[PDB]
Amino acid sequence: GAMGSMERASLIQKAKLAEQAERYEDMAAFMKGAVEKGEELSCEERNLLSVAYKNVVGGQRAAWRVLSSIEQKSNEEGSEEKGPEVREYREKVETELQGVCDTVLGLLDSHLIKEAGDAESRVFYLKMKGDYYRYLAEVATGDDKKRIIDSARSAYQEAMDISKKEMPPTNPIRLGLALNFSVFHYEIANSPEEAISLAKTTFDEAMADLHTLSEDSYKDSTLIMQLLRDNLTLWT
């Protein structure tokens, strides 16, 4: 698109600058441009792509939750009717969020996933597919909701199967995948027992492999393990 005339290396350089400046919409546009060059992404580049879109969609998610809450309050009994404006603005934000999710899913489908052969890359991308379908699920209503949930679940499962076969239990990508799939189960799929089971097993298997790690790797793994523990503490 609009980044078609810029060199791939220049797009990556500017993505890094935009991260420093907390200009995440710019960062996302630069990284979309880099993906569209058609070459596979390095580990660092995959992280830049993830940072960019997570910050953009995170802003949208937060705003949507605020607006949804106001809307729900207005639709209580004894609430003075104030017109269509709350619903309209919530729908505007919702549509913009859906559009960001669809952009990310588009990039993964054309053609990041199919060209990803190594476990580290394929699991990263499949986790991301799960995540962005889950964000779509948060705002979906009804029958759309069922198919969106199934799409998220299927992506997460495929990622889990690869990660279990190909990565150590302490691998950060494997841990973050399991963390997010567990939240999926609890918050989206109405399966709190599956959520708790997955988080516990993931934590215990990582604990037993920590002895193999360097000081730096130990720090990376234990950070994500603490997130599993924090959720388990909330849930039990």
């Binding site: 995540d131 973050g176 995948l177 963390l179 997010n180 939240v183 994500i224 997130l227 959720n231 909330l234």
Partner: peptide, 9 residues
Amino acid sequence: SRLQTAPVP
């Protein structure tokens, strides 16, 4: 806390 998901570097 509330629930947490994976951080981004």
